[PDB]
Amino acid sequence: LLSIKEAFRLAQQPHQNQAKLVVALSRTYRTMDDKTVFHEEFIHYLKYVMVVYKREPAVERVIEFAAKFVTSDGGLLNYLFTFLLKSHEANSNAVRFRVCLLINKLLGSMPDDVFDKINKAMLIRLKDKIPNVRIQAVLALSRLQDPKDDECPVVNAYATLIENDSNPEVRRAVLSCIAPSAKTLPKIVGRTKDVKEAVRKLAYQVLAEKVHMRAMSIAQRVMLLQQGLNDRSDAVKQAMQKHLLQGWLRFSEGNILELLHRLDVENSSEVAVSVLNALFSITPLSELVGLCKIPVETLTPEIALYWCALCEYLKSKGDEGEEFLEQILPEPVVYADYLLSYIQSIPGNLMTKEFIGQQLILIIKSLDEEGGRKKLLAVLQEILILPTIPISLVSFLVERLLHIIIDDNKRTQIVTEIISEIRAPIVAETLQKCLILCYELLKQMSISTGLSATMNGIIESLILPGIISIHPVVRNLAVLCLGCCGLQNQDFARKHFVLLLQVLQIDDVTIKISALKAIFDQLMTFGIEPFKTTAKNVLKLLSDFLDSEVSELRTGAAEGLAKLMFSGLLVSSRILSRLILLWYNPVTEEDVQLRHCLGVFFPVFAYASRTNQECFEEAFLPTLQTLANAPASSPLAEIDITNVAELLVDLTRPSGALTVHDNLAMKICNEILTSPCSPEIRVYTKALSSLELSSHLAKDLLVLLNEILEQVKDRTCLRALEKIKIQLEK
Amino acid sequence: EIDFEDDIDFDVYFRKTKAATILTKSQNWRATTLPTFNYNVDTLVQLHLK
Missing domain, CATH: 1.25.40 (Serine Threonine Protein Phosphatase 5, Tetratricopeptide repeat)
Structure with a gap:
């Protein structure tokens, strides 16, 4: 057989x-x-x-x-x-x-x-x-496997393996087998952050194909949609959009509106728009516009945000979208009455009505006709004048209003008309509403038409008196407005710059942050010199905020100083020393903004020019000596000196006529020769050995190194110094 | 191509010795997962008020 x-x-x-x-x-x-x-x-x-x-x-x-x-x-x-x-x-x-x-x-x-x-x-x-x-x-x-029986030994191992196995395929294997259970779900969705693209791609498939949309919290759905949408690879983008979003969309019956309800549109609306835009580009306009029966007033925030995101989309699809856009929007003016009648219906806590309000206020920049402009400007003005309206909508309305006017003087006038209206009857929030307009006016104003004599009215009438206001919310916008004005006229900045510094030390903390922004934007625009010809100590003030207890102030000071240095407007080996130290300071580990900012600045600043590197070279010794002289109590004593020196030598390499590293070698040999048995002797020698020494400096250097070999007593440093000697002898 | 003809003593392969599994000591998700900030050098030249 x-x-x-x-x-x-x-x-x-x-x-x-x-x-x-x-x-x-x-x-x-x-x-x-x-x-x-x-x-x-x-x-x-x-x-x-x-x-x-x-x-x-x-x-x-x-x-x-x-x-x-x-x-x-x-x-x-x-x-x-x-x-x-x-x-x-x-x-x-x-x-x-x-x-x-x-x-x-x-x-x-x-x-x-x-x-x-x-x-x-x-x-x-x-x-x-x-x-x-x-x-x-x-x-x-x-x-x-057995999902029902809690703590199954298969699902347990899978739970361990899916996150802890060194090998990507082992994980990718467990990811395709693991049964979607309550404890398992977090591990599965957690694989959307896996290092390996193939694991991340697969996690979206298993999620879309093995887990029900209900099983996931609203917060998780937004994390997945957002995360996958801006993931490093289009392979992962397409994976989430193909399996998960179109799958989540399918459970909605292919209806986008129903899907929005599930994404908690009110809070995470930016993500929702992204989801919308991604989804919009893959469905015909006839259908997307179909979701709207001219407006219908009783609507949800999901409805409002949709129509707003669609109208902005349809305006971008230039010509074809013109046809479908005119289907849902009425001519500019009739919309104004529509906008107005909604804002009136606002005195259980319907934050939801403020949100929906923004969405309709935001639809304004999808309208268009000279008669219509005036009647949009009409209702917009009316709304801004009306009390009881929440300040949240003020900024958005003002921006929509200012967009249309075209003229800086006509904007300042239309605004002046509105503030005087709000200032007639008699509290602090009526001052806030006004300053919100002033601010949104100053920021969009071009530098050419600086400080129209009409503005100086508002500056004298509203802006300046705002700074001494008893209400803190008032002062903040006052400062922000003052700084925007100072940007307009240099002489204006000079007069009130001293005032801005006053706010910095005396005033509340949240106002300070605004003050820093003001002062720094003005120093970046006019330089430091024109302000020392009143405040001779401006650089000292901003500097002492590096040692602030408030994160926002450290990061404000630090970044502002970094900006001044990068554009060659500030040269200070002291402050640069204080910066490098601040970056290594443990007190800063949870200041993400600060630590990240400097991390970019130091390198890009260093390699920009020799003068920049020279600034680091000048700061070399004072930095490591600030470290070595730190008592046990300070966070500085925690710092590792070798890491800092290696960074300085790194920033000062000529791979980025006596070179900067040549000067450094001198500074270091001179220091080693000053105290050859210093506690930092090991550090300085390492810095010495890692330097990029020029060829012609060798004979002069050799002279120094020989004497160093006589005085240095640490046998470890000696063997390294002898090693340097042979290289020079070459 | 597999030769099923020659009688091979497969004991060399199936026999037991030491030691099959990875050691008890041997790791965290830190290795497998990506770390979630962005600072553009352009923000270094940009203003706070505009």
Whole structure:
């Protein structure tokens, strides 16, 4: 008949039908008597393909055959199972891999303590040295999961492995098997942050295809949508959008509005717009505009935000969108009455009405006609004049209003008209509303038309008196407005610059931040010099805020000083020393803005020019000596001096006539020679050895290094210095 | 190509020794997961009020 060896030798061949070989050998099996002789024969020849780790296709064909055949005293599949479980600890990596592989394939093709021994054995192999063996074990144990039974030992291992396995495929393996349960869900969605692109891509598929939209909190849905949308690879973008978003959209019945309700549109609206824009670009306009029956007044925030994001979209699809845009929007003026009638309906806590209000106020820049401008400006003015309106909408209305006017003087006038209106009757929020207009006027105002004599009215009437206001919310906008004015006229800045400094030290903290912004924007625009010809100490003030207890002030001071340096407006090896120190200071570890800002500045500032590097070289010794002289109490004593010196040498390399590193070598040899047995002797020598020394400095340097070799007593530093000596001698 | 003919003593392969699984000591998600800030050098030349 057909013997097992022929059957296997045949299955080895590429083009050889397997359905046939099953039938041929299958008879050979039943035709034999005492099946155990066949049983022992089957395993014997199966061994020839269990001892090969590499995926040669011949080997793979036999495995598939032996597995397919078997699953198409107790035996034969049970005989084979018994054999596999006894061999799963074999010293050969191949065997252990094949054993798990076969068990996996067996468990997958088939229609007693064997289930228990498998579950036990594969659970062991989850810890295999060889990654592939662990993978097969995961695939093997996949069918043997149980979500309902809490703390299953398969789902547990999966929970551990999916996050903790060194090997990406092992994780990617567990990610495709893991059953979406309550404890499991967080691990699965957590793989959308996996280092490997293939794991991240897959996490969105399993999420979209194995987990229900309900199982995920609203917060998680926004994290997934946002995260996947701006993920480093378009492979991951497309993966989330294809499987997850279009899947989440499908549960909505392919309706976008219903989907929005699920994304908590009020708070995370920016993300929602992104989702909208991504979704918009893949559906015809006839359908997107269809979601809107001219406006319908009783609406949800999901409805408002949709129409607003669609109108802005439709205006961007230039010509085609013109047709579909005119379908949903009424002519500019009739919209004004529509806008107005809504704002009136505002005195349980309907924040929701403020949000929806913004969305309609924001639709204004999708309208358009000279008559209509005046009647939009009309309602906008009316709304701004009306009390009871929340300040949240003020800024948005003012911006929409100022956009249209075109003329800086006409803006200042239309504004002046509005403030005088609000100033007639009689509290602090009426001052806030006004200053909000002043601010939004100053920031959009071009520098040319600086301080129109009408503005000086508002400056004298509203802006200046605002600074001494008893209400803190008033002062803040006052300062912000003053700084915007100072940017307009240099002489104006000069007069009130001293006032701005006053606000810096005396006033409330949140006002200070505004003050810093003001002062720094003015120093960046007019330089430091014109302000020392009243405040001779301006640089001292801003500097002492680096040692502030408030994060916003450290980061404000630090960044503002970094900006002044980068544009060559400030040269200070002191402040630069205080900056480098601030960046290494432990007190700053949770000041993300600060630490990140400087991290970019130091390098880009250093390599910009020699004078910049020279600034670092001048700061070298004072920095490390500030460190070495720090008492145990200060956070500075915590700092590592070697890290700082290496950074300074790094920033000062000529790979970015006596070079800067040549001057440094001098400074350092002069220092080493001053105190050769200093506690920092090790640091200075390392700095010395890592320098990029010019060729012509060698003879002069050699002279110094010899004397250093005489005075330095640390045997460690000496061996390094001798090593430097031989290099020079070359 | 697999030669099923020659009687190979497969004991060398299936035999037990030491030691199969990775050691008890052996890691965190820090290695597998990406760290979530962006500072453009252009913000260094930009104003706060505009």
